[PDB]
Every structure is written in C-alpha cells, then in structure tokens.
Amino acid sequence: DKLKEAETRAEFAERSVTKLEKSIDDLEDELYAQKLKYKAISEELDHALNDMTSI
Amino acid sequence: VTKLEKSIDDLEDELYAQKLKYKAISEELDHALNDMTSI
C-alpha cells in the first residue's frame, strides 16, 4: 500500500520537473537571444555615439 | 558634424576677411583707372 502511494507521487513529481525544465529551457533560450540582440545594439551604440562626437 | 562645423566657421571667417580686403582694392581701382584716363 505504501507503494502505490510512493510510486504515484513520484510520477507526479517527475511530470512537474519535466514541465519546469521545459519552461527553464524556453526562458534561458529566449535569453541568449535577448542578451545577444543587445551586444549588437549597445555596440552599434558606442559606434553611433562616436561618429557624431567626431562629425 | 563638429569637424565640419569647425571647418564652416573657419571658411565663413576667412571670408568676410576676403570680401572686405576687396572693397578696398576695387575702390582703389575706380580711382586708379580715373586719373590715367585724365592724364
């Protein structure tokens, strides 16, 4: 009896971990996409502040 | 822009200097053409 209970709950904990792991990979990927989409606009920036201080 | 603005002020100033350095030689001129037509 202790068994049916330990196993059923293990299955629910595993379903919840795979759900949360799937949501961590989407946020961490949406991420390097944001973190990188920036190095580009902040670098396009030191550049686009340097040429008008020069022109 | 700061480079070209600096070059516009130097040319515009070199300018009123040229434009004025002349009124003087063109006026020294109507004069220095009139006396030899007279002599």
Curated annotation (Swiss-Prot), chain A:
PTM: Phosphorylated at Ser-54 by DAPK1 in response to oxidative stress and this phosphorylation enhances stress fiber formation in endothelial cells.
Q: Can you say where in the cell this protein is located?
A: Cytoplasm, Cytoskeleton
Location of Phosphoserine modifications: S23, S42, S54
Q: What is the top-level taxon of the source organism? A: Eukaryota
Q: Which residues carry this modification: Phosphotyrosine?
A: Y32
Per the entry's comment, what about the domains?
The molecule is in a coiled coil structure that is formed by 2 polypeptide chains. The sequence exhibits a prominent seven-residues periodicity.
The record's family statement is:
Belongs to the tropomyosin family.
**What role does this protein play?**
Binds to actin filaments in muscle and non-muscle cells. Plays a central role, in association with the troponin complex, in the calcium dependent regulation of vertebrate striated muscle contraction. Smooth muscle contraction is regulated by interaction with caldesmon. In non-muscle cells is implicated in stabilizing cytoskeleton actin filaments.
Task: Summarize the subunit comment.
Answer: Homodimer. Heterodimer of an alpha (TPM1, TPM3 or TPM4) and a beta (TPM2) chain. Interacts with HRG (via the HRR domain); the interaction contributes to the antiangiogenic properties of the histidine/proline-rich region (HRR) of HRG. Interacts (via N-terminus) with LMOD2 (via N-terminus) and TMOD1 (via N-terminus).
Instruction: Return the protein name.
Output: Tropomyosin alpha-1 chain
Species assigned in the record? Oryctolagus cuniculus
Q: What is the lineage of its organism?
A: Eukaryota, Metazoa, Chordata, Craniata, Vertebrata
